[PDB]
């Protein structure tokens, strides 16, 4: 298994082209555990492998890039994922994180509360989500599209993600949403990525690379999630932390990607070409302001 | 605050855990506090905020302005003291010339 030296495994294109029915996820390696470097947390290992994978894609990387991270709080009250993102991202990158409960973070700004209580008029270049509700998993009922925080993620992408931007959203067998898969078709490229350290889990990151703001391809989310599970059920992934031992090429290379403010009437086919190659970001560059709502009562 | 922790260690004092240890090459400059992990062969790098007593306890920082020199940065700790990063950062201090830990890398003499 040559995949063991990779940071993880991306869903092969042929699996994306099937029309499968949703089945239970039954992983062969379920229960196994990867051997992490001494004293390293699973959350640190997982995010390190996600970033090592993102390095191989055509992410747009402007000056003073804007990154937002959802579901960043751990049970212990810290933000391991945020620490890895800050290590990975160019120095000076604006990094904002968020979660439902309080936690200590290395982010430039931390937002506590749900989506309905936070607001910004600013656009972002990269969205990372580790949001996940453990009570979502229920094997005694049908596995339908989830319509909670995922509806907010979809709304955030379609309104606050800059053209040329990218996303990495955590999903699982039971934590998923049909509209989010459909929205993957609005990017120049997409995949479902499984980290090698957590390959015994149904977890994956839906990765949308270079947002076009329009459907490049029509994707049925119900079918694509079924395709994802079929892939996982028929392709055992060997648990591996091998990639964690070589961090020499870890930092995201600065590309100094151009940021331009254009209108929908100016987005021609040559602009789409630049967006698709991660050579352009379309958004304004105003001061970044985030609002936090407070319900007041006596 | 910082005084109580020193004495808390006595009588089987439990050291603050869950400090976020980072993956790195361990071929860094070895400086105390940096914008990215800079641990050498004898150090571990941790996310700054998770090693700051003031951040962890959700209390004000000693500077009148309220600035934290750990949050958003990485702190290098000797591998021998990696079991207690918060404690090590309190006790020791950084050299304002070379930016190394005093008695743990600093040799401006
Ligand atoms: O407009 C706006 N929405 C949000 C957050 C939405 C949200 C979606 C999914 C999940 Cl999982 C969590 C959240 Cl919080 C955030 C912001 C701001 F942070 F940029 F101000 N501004
Ligand atoms: Na960095
Ligand atoms: Zn602090
Ligand atoms: Zn010195």
């Amino acid at each position: 298994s040559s995949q063991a030296w990779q940071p993880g495994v991306a869903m092969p294109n042929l699996y994306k082209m099937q029309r499968m029915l949703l089945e239970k996820c039954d992983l062969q390696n379920y229960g196994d555990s990867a051997t992490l470097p001494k004293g390293i947390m699973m959350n640190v290992a997982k995010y390190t492998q996600l970033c090592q994978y993102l390095n191989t894609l055509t992410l747009a990387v402007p000056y003073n890039m804007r990154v937002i991270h959802f579901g960043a709080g751990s049970d212990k009250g810290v933000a391991p994922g945020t620490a890895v993102l800050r290590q990975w991202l160019p120095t000076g990158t604006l990094l904002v994180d968020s979660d439902l409960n309080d936690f200590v973070s290395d982010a430039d700004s931390t937002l506590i509360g749900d989506c309905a209580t936070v607001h910004t008029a600013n656009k972002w270049d990269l969205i990372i989500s580790d949001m996940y509700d453990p009570k979502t998993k229920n094997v005694t009922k049908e596995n339908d599209s989830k319509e909670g925080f995922f509806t907010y993620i979809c709304g955030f992408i379609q309104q606050k993600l800059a053209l040329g931007g990218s996303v990495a959203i955590k999903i699982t067998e039971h934590s998923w949403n049909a509209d989010l898969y459909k929205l993957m078709g609005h990017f120049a490229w997409w995949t479902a990525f499984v980290t090698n350290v957590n390959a015994s889990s149904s977890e994956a990151f839906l990765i949308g690379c270079n947002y076009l703001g329009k459907p490049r391809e029509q994707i049925d989310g119900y079918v694509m999630h079924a395709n994802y599970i079929f892939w996982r059920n028929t392709n055992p992934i060997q648990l591996s932390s091998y990639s964690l031992f070589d961090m020499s090429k870890f930092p995201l290379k600065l590309r100094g990607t151009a940021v331009m403010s254009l209108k929908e009437g100016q987005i021609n086919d040559m602009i789409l070409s630049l967006l698709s190659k991660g050579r352009l970001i379309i958004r304004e560059n105003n001061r970044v302001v985030i609002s936090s709502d407070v319900l007041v009562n006596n | 605050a910082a005084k109580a922790y020193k004495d808390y260690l006595a009588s089987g004092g439990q050291p603050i855990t869950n400090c976020v240890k980072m993956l790195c090459t361990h071929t860094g400059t070895g400086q105390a506090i940096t914008v990215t992990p800079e641990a050498n062969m004898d150090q571990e790098s941790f996310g700054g905020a998770s090693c700051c007593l003031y951040c962890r306890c959700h209390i004000d920082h000693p500077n009148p302005k309220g600035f934290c020199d750990l949050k958003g940065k990485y702190v290098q700790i000797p591998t021998t003291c990696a079991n207690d990063p918060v404690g090590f950062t309190l006790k020791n201090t950084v050299c304002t010339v070379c930016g190394m830990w005093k008695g743990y890398g600093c040799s401006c003499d």
Side-chain angles (χ1 to χ4, degrees):
Chain A
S1 183
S2 179
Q3 291 176 345
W5 288 283
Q6 300 176 2
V9 183
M11 167 173 198
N13 292 347
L14 188 64
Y15 285 99
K16 299 175 182 171
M17 285 173 88
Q18 305 307 306
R19 298 298 182 244
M20 301 305 316
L21 295 191
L22 183 66
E23 297 292 354
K24 293 177 55 57
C25 190
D26 181 4
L27 299 190
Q28 175 177 292
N29 298 358
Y30 184 65
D32 295 2
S33 301
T35 65
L36 299 183
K38 181 183 178 182
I40 296 299
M41 271 174 205
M42 168 62 84
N43 285 349
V44 168
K46 177 188 302 182
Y47 277 65
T48 300
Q49 294 188 318
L50 174 66
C51 293
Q52 297 175 310
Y53 179 64
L54 292 184
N55 282 339
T56 67
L57 302 188
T58 62
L59 293 197
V61 184
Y63 288 107
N64 302 1
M65 154 181 206
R66 301 174 179 180
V67 179
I68 189 171
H69 183 204
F70 301 120
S74 67
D75 299 358
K76 310 303 179 181
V78 291
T82 299
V84 173
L85 290 184
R86 168 149 291 193
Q87 176 185 8
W88 180 58
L89 292 174
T91 301
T93 299
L94 181 76
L95 175 65
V96 173
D97 64 3
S98 170
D99 203 350
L100 297 186
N101 305 301
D102 300 300
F103 61 106
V104 177
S105 177
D106 288 293
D108 301 301
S109 178
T110 296
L111 304 188
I112 311 301
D114 54 300
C115 178
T117 66
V118 297
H119 306 292
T120 186
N122 297 108
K123 293 191 176 183
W124 303 72
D125 307 313
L126 178 69
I127 303 175
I128 308 294
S129 176
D130 182 55
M131 182 69 213
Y132 174 66
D133 181 354
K135 300 179 180 179
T136 193
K137 181 178 181 179
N138 186 2
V139 300
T140 71
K141 196 172 186 301
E142 191 173 3
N143 184 7
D144 293 353
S145 181
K146 302 304 185 302
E147 303 295 352
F149 67 74
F150 282 116
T151 67
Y152 292 113
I153 293 180
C154 294
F156 191 74
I157 293 174
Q158 293 183 293
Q159 296 171 56
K160 304 297 171 53
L161 182 67
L163 298 184
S166 295
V167 308
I169 309 300
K170 173 184 171 177
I171 66 175
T172 70
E173 177 186 6
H174 295 262
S175 183
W176 64 287
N177 172 277
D179 291 302
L180 180 65
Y181 275 107
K182 178 181 299 300
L183 189 62
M184 284 305 97
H186 293 227
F187 296 71
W189 187 79
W190 74 284
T191 194
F193 177 70
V194 176
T195 66
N196 274 340
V197 292
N198 200 24
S200 58
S201 169
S202 63
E203 167 186 288
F205 285 94
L206 275 188
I207 298 177
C209 186
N210 305 130
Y211 183 56
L212 299 187
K214 61 185 299 180
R216 180 183 62 68
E217 63 174 303
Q218 302 300 304
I219 296 179
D220 185 310
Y222 299 99
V223 168
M224 187 61 74
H225 190 60
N227 291 346
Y228 170 68
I229 300 302
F230 178 63
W231 167 51
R232 295 307 305 287
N233 283 344
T234 61
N235 293 66
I237 299 171
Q238 181 179 303
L239 284 178
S240 181
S241 61
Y242 295 175
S243 71
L244 302 186
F245 293 77
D246 187 3
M247 290 293 305
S248 60
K249 308 301 180 181
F250 186 64
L252 177 65
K253 291 70 177 64
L254 296 76
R255 301 179 63 181
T257 308
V259 170
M260 275 174 209
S261 181
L262 301 190
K263 292 183 176 59
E264 298 180 0
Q266 303 179 63
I267 305 179
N268 60 62
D269 297 0
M270 164 285 323
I271 295 299
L272 291 189
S273 180
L274 291 189
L275 291 184
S276 297
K277 299 173 183 178
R279 296 179 183 177
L280 180 75
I281 284 288
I282 299 178
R283 61 170 172 67
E284 294 186 1
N285 186 58
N286 305 310
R287 53 195 291 289
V288 176
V289 171
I290 298 179
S291 305
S292 181
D293 293 359
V294 177
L295 177 73
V296 186
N297 55 62
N298 186 3
Chain B
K3 300 64 175 60
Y5 187 65
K6 174 59 180 180
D7 299 299
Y8 176 58
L9 298 194
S11 300
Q14 300 296 357
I16 300 180
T17 61
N18 302 303
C19 297
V20 177
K21 190 171 70 174
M22 308 305 313
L23 285 170
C24 58
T25 59
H26 294 262
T27 60
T29 63
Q31 296 182 358
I33 308 175
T34 54
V35 299
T36 196
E38 289 290 354
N40 64 13
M41 33 177 211
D42 308 302
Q43 292 171 347
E44 293 289 6
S45 295
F46 298 74
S50 65
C51 298
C52 177
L53 180 75
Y54 307 113
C55 286
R56 297 294 299 250
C57 300
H58 295 62
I59 65 182
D60 301 359
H61 295 64
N63 297 359
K65 56 182 176 179
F67 179 59
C68 184
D69 57 358
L70 296 191
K71 178 183 177 63
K73 296 179 180 299
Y74 302 78
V75 59
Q76 284 56 240
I77 305 296
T79 301
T80 59
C81 307
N83 59 298
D84 183 3
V86 176
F88 179 101
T89 61
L90 292 188
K91 300 175 182 179
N92 300 249
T93 58
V94 177
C95 176
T96 60
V97 174
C98 62
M100 289 295 210
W101 287 111
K102 298 177 62 61
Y104 290 110
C106 175
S107 61
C108 292
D109 302 2

